[PDB]
Amino acid sequence: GKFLCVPNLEGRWHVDGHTRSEGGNTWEGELKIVQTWDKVRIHLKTKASHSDSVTASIIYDKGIGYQLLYNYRNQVGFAEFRFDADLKSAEGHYFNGATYGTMTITRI
Amino acid sequence: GKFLCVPNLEGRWHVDGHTRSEGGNTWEGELKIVQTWDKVRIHLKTKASHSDSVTASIIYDKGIGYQLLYNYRNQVGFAEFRFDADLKSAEGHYFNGATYGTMTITRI
Numbered sequence: 001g002k003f004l005c006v007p008n009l010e011g012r013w014h015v016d017g018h019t020r021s022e023g024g025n026t027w028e029g030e031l032k033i034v035q036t037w038d039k040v041r042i043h044l045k046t047k048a049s050h051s052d053s054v055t056a057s058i059i060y061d062k063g064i065g066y067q068l069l070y071n072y073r074n075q076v077g078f079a080e081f082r083f084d085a086d087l088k089s090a091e092g093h094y095f096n097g098a099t100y101g102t103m104t105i106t107r108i
Numbered sequence: 109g110k111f112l113c114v115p116n117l118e119g120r121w122h123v124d125g126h127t128r129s130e131g132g133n134t135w136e137g138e139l140k141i142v143q144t145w146d147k148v149r150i151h152l153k154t155k156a157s158h159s160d161s162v163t164a165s166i167i168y169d170k171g172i173g174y175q176l177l178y179n180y181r182n183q184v185g186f187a188e189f190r191f192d193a194d195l196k197s198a199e200g201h202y203f204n205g206a207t208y209g210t211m212t213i214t215r216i
Contacts, residue, residue: 001116001199002115002116002194002195003113003115003116004115004116004145005111005112005113005114006112006113007110007111007112008109008110008111008112009151035112037112037145037146038145052188055189087110088111107113
């Protein structure tokens with residue numbers, strides 16, 4: 001490519017979560033993304049636990065937008081986010097092997 | 109910024125050089141730029157010497173284009189390049205403290 005380019009995902013994000021697996025409920029949390037070029041670290045804080053990402057990848061899809069894929073360790077799951085074009089929000093889901101659910105994040 | 113972006117300067121470049129200090133002459137060489145995001149290493153090979161960069165910085169100026177500034181050690185000088193918009197060539201100069209001159213590079 002002519003330019004080496006990554007979306008700027010750094011900062012704090014509010015999390016609206018919904019556990020979709022049985023007995024699951026709505027929840028809230030706060031995401032902290034720390035980024036050095038294409039290397040991203042994701043910390044999620046809820047009332048009930050913390051998690052930090054283990055490995056994360058930023059990917060691009062034409063017509064869809066940028067996506068962040070990562071595994072994480074709860075106090076080992078998988079999560080992914082698809083960012084809107086303005087990088088101010090994202091919709092995502094997670095799977096912890098069995099719990100799974102969705103998340104909406106809004107940049108703070 | 110919304111995007112973390114650096115010009116892709118990686119590859120081999122042909123060097124047309126001109127020493128402008130007294131008794132200076134035309135010369136030729138080959139440049140190798142190795143790049144990890146905004147960290148750049150520049151190796152110049154001529155018939156008479158090698159040099160490797162010590163510290164290098166990519167900078168952007170609106171209306172001028174991207175520039176590469178670095179110091180280097182000959183077998184300690186300063187050099188800078190202003191790339192054309194398509195990143196296929198650049199014009200530059202160097203100062204070794206006293207020799208100084210110009211360089212044109214074309215991407216291979």
